[PDB]
Design a protein around this nucleic acid. Structure first.
Ligand code: CL
Ligand code: CL
Ligand code: CL
Ligand code: CL
Ligand code: MN
Ligand code: MN
Ligand code: MN
Ligand code: MN
Ligand code: MN
Ligand code: MN
Ligand code: MN
Ligand code: MN
Ligand code: MN
Ligand code: MN
Ligand code: MN
Ligand code: MN
Ligand code: MN
Lengths: 104, 97, 92, 78, 93, 108, 84, 97
DNA sequence: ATCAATATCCACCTGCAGATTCTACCAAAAGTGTATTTGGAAACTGCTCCATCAAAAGGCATGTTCAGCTGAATTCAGCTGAACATGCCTTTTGATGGAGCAGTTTCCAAATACACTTTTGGTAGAATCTGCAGGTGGATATTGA
DNA sequence: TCAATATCCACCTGCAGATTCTACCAAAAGTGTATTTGGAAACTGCTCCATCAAAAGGCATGTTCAGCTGAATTCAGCTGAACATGCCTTTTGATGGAGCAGTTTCCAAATACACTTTTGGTAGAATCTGCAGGTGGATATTGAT
């Protein structure tokens, strides 16, 4: 009976609607707008968690940490593009050593 | 007595710190720096500890990124050694100068 | 009380990786992420509405805003999901 | 207190940045740079604190200050 | 259908600072862009300030803080003086 | 009926306070706008406008022009470090660039 | 009613040279021209993509100056002079 | 028969174009480029004339700025000649790649 | 090229401190059911602009030749910067006490919203005004010989 | 010092572009209720801050040396300069029609409001996972043929 369940979403449609209404974005908010926005946030979230979870499994951790989020993000061209100006606290950087610096 | 050649340990250290995520500046010195700077703008300020930590995360992230760009500049001049002029070029192309 | 997106992030995590957890700090990062993208899409949708002299933000503004904000494939899948959710919602 | 940021700390940061060899002059240069950065951020942070009529700089003040300088920070209250 | 712009005000200010100097239409177009830009930066920062502090009102306090965040140095100090002076004269009636 | 004084004349300003108030009100910045906010904003916009015109006008005078053109605006902005900072990501159409030739490129 | 093709080649070597001159460049490798065409093409694509998105959103068939200004703005390259 | 040395006329041209503000790409070819690209996103689009001009102002401004940065990179490598790797370095540090 | 001989990683182990997940209570949000408004779509429709086409002159793109000087490749050692062993001091970590601030609630005086009615500043052309763009030539620098 | 060029630099005026003039009318301003709100009082527990202390481990220092940087040198082409050719850009006007604005009318969609249900935040308990050290084997680096 929640708007989220009606939309087949985990993310909260009602909260998103209230946040649109209170964010000084516009005088009015249409009914589909928070459904759509919630859907998009949920999708991007699932994408990042999918990759991060893979990295956590490879590191044989059951638990995702910032490092895994950073690995997931920087190794994906599109996520990295989307989050280009973003600093992930405790994420570190990708191991990358310029070829010229290596011996031989 | 055993001695690695200059550069071998450097490479080792690059692998090490690129693999790790911990803060690389010592806490008490950074915090002291933060408070000193803050006094110049407004006085008798307090800090949430997490505020100090945010500042340190931000600064170290900024410096590491700057050093990446600086390194690309050094290599561009066929050098392996970063110099102030590398930093200066990176900061100019970033728009910081 | 302070609200966050944590329980929803955890729900989505259990969907894509049933046996995988998340640290307190990685959850902090996911929350920042959701607030950031929300703010980008919402404020772009607001600008679209204003430019066209509308006082309503509709799913059309959100869709366009997503086309402006997301790169490539990401935008395509986002648009697909949004559309699908709105359709499912409208059906019931 | 800027000298409290030690040479091996700066070296460690450069290492994470992929740097193999470092000129003796870099350390002082890095300090100046770091100082400018911190100044700018803390300036805005304090402005936020003042605006909220507070005497305590919060994580959020720092986050908003970083955001407005085009350097979004995740994990501290975004 | 009419369009509003800042042209006449820009021109008035021009005549104040340089009484015998004119301005081309394209330079006036650039000044109009400038005013609209800075307007949007200040207003949206002020809006953010108000939101952050759980106020529903944008006041001269938000505008001032926004100006201190957006303008460098002396530019901010002089802007703040002008703003302050105008609000006090205005409240006097 | 008292004879109207404009809010601009009340504030001692050239920029239009009433218009600014309406623009704040209809840009969805906040549910409420304080009486002094559009005054302050109009005053700041006016000041920054006067600053750029002052510098630009000087540029036009040094070049013996009575008319300000985009070139003079650009000269004024890029030669003033704080303005250049403020407008760092701004393109001035028909502004050109500052004459600057790297020393190493010159002959000797 | 005449088909537009390969117009990136219309951006000539001497045009590109003039641009580098205004950029303070004294000497230019022969490979720059093609390189510059690629760069310009990417740039124009991104801007025009966003501009047209605004045009489509407004249910218009005409790209306006403002469409372009908004597209540049959204990409962090604020342009003055075209709010006419 | 008179001949300037290579670089003497180049320098003269730098002074010339740095003094002037006119668009350096020919209008009509630029206009065809803009139309070709926009038609590829959506067909039968029209353009306000000033929209094409906004695009040209923006493009030339971007390219000129890029050439400034590229020039600094060439000079950093002890060269007077800009090369593709200079453009690529500048764009990498700009965040464009 | 390969081969002994160290030095340092790196995967793996166990036992628990302690992060995370689970639980259960409860204000606060979300949902619901009606009732009412209203923003904005449709549908005409008059005018702008816009796209294409056309002409014609000359500005400028193009292609070519030739050689100045640049980029690239090389050689060499002085002296910078890395590696390392030592021992001292700064930072970490742990503990305590206290006070200075955020964060909350309640209640009005003050401030803002908003409709209705007047009143005027701002705009769109039209009329008027006038910089400076091009068009000259002569004087001063600069370049390369 | 002299030719060959290029660049200043002052001068001149008519017309494209800028400014001023005019008069309607949209939008501000005045006025008078209606609604909100920000902030003073008076609290109340948390975080911070200040101080104190021990001891670990990381930094500062001095010495030695490997090798990188920068200077010097050399040469083959690449790229700039100069020129003739002739095309295509530039300017400006015509033409026909697509597309925008502008206006009116009227619902599908959005807000408002009163009240009930449902949920998400929060802080301890319960659960279980990283991680601190330690190991031994895996991978490299060094020095020497
Ligand atoms: Cl909708
Ligand atoms: Cl240097
Ligand atoms: Cl106010
Ligand atoms: Cl190259
Ligand atoms: Mn003056
Ligand atoms: Mn009614
Ligand atoms: Mn209506
Ligand atoms: Mn030809
Ligand atoms: Mn020939
Ligand atoms: Mn050379
Ligand atoms: Mn030696
Ligand atoms: Mn009047
Ligand atoms: Mn002239
Ligand atoms: Mn005329
Ligand atoms: Mn629940
Ligand atoms: Mn108990
Ligand atoms: Mn361990």
């Amino acid at each position: 009976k929640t708007r989220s369940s009606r939309a087949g979403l985990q993310f909260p449609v009602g909260r998103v609607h209230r946040l649109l209404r209170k964010g000084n974005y516009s005088e009015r908010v249409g009914a589909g707008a928070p459904v759509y926005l919630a859907a998009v946030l949920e999708y991007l979230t699932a994408e990042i968690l999918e990759l991060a979870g893979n990295a956590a499994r490879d590191n044989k951790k059951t638990r995702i940490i910032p490092r895994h989020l950073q690995l997931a993000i920087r190794n994906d061209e599109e996520l990295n593009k989307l989050l280009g100006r973003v600093t992930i606290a405790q994420g570190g950087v990708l191991p990358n050593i310029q070829a010229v610096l290596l011996p031989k | 007595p055993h001695r690695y050649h200059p550069g071998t340990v450097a490479l080792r250290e690059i692998r090490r710190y690129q693999k790790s995520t911990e803060l690389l500046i010592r806490k008490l010195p950074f915090q002291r720096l933060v408070r000193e700077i803050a006094q110049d703008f407004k006085t008798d300020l307090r800090f949430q500890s997490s505020a100090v930590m945010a500042l340190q995360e931000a600064c170290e992230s900024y410096l590491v990124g700057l050093f990446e760009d600086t390194n690309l500049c050094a290599i561009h001049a066929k050098r392996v050694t970063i110099m102030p002029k590398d930093i200066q070029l990176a900061r100019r192309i970033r728009g910081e100068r | 009380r302070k609200e966050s997106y944590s329980i929803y992030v955890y729900k989505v995590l259990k969907q894509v990786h049933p046996d995988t957890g998340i640290s307190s700090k990685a959850m902090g990062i996911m929350n920042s992420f959701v607030n950031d993208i929300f703010e980008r899409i919402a404020s772009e949708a607001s600008r679209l509405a204003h430019y066209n002299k509308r006082s309503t933000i509709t799913s059309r503004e959100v869709q366009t805003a997503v086309r402006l904000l997301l790169p490539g494939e990401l935008a395509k899948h986002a648009v697909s999901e949004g559309t699908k959710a709105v359709t499912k919602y409208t059906s019931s | 207190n800027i000298q409290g940021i030690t040479k091996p700390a700066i070296r460690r940061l450069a290492r994470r940045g992929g740097v193999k060899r470092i000129s003796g002059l870099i350390y002082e240069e890095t300090r100046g740079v770091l100082k400018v950065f911190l100044e700018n951020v803390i300036r805005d942070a304090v402005t936020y604190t003042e605006h909220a009529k507070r005497k305590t700089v919060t994580a959020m003040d720092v986050v908003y200050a970083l955001k407005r300088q085009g350097r979004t920070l995740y994990g501290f209250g975004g």
